[PDB]
Amino acid sequence: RICRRRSAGFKGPCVSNKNCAQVCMQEGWGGGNCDGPLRRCKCMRRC
């Protein structure tokens, strides 16, 4: 399975998708995903 976890350490709203991918990798997570109204970010990796 791939787990989606709210991006811990991301600076506010997901205006930059690129920086959410980084914050997720920074966290030890595969990629990052911007959720709902984009104004909150998630991280995705295998679990």
Indicate which CATH number applies to the domain containing 43. 3.30.30.10
Contact present, 23 and 43 (Cβ < 8 Å):
yes
**10-46 residues labelled b (16+ CB within 10 A) or e (exposed):** beeebeeeebbbebbeeeebeebbbeeeeeebbbbbe
- Cα 6 from chain centroid (whole Å): 6
> How many Å apart are CA 24 and CA 44, to the nearest integer?
7
Rg of the Cα trace of the chain?
Answer: 9
Q: Are 5 and 40 in contact (CB under 8 A)?
A: no
Instruction: Tell me how the structure was determined.
Output: NMR
Residue labelled with tokens 């966290």: 27
| Structural domain containing residue 21 | 1-47
Structure tokens, 37: 């109204």
Tally of domains in the chain = 1
Amino acid at 41: C
Residue 5's CB is within 10 A of a number of other CB atoms, namely 15
* Cα–Cα distance list, 36 to 25, 26, 42, 46, 47 (Å): 21, 22, 10, 21, 22
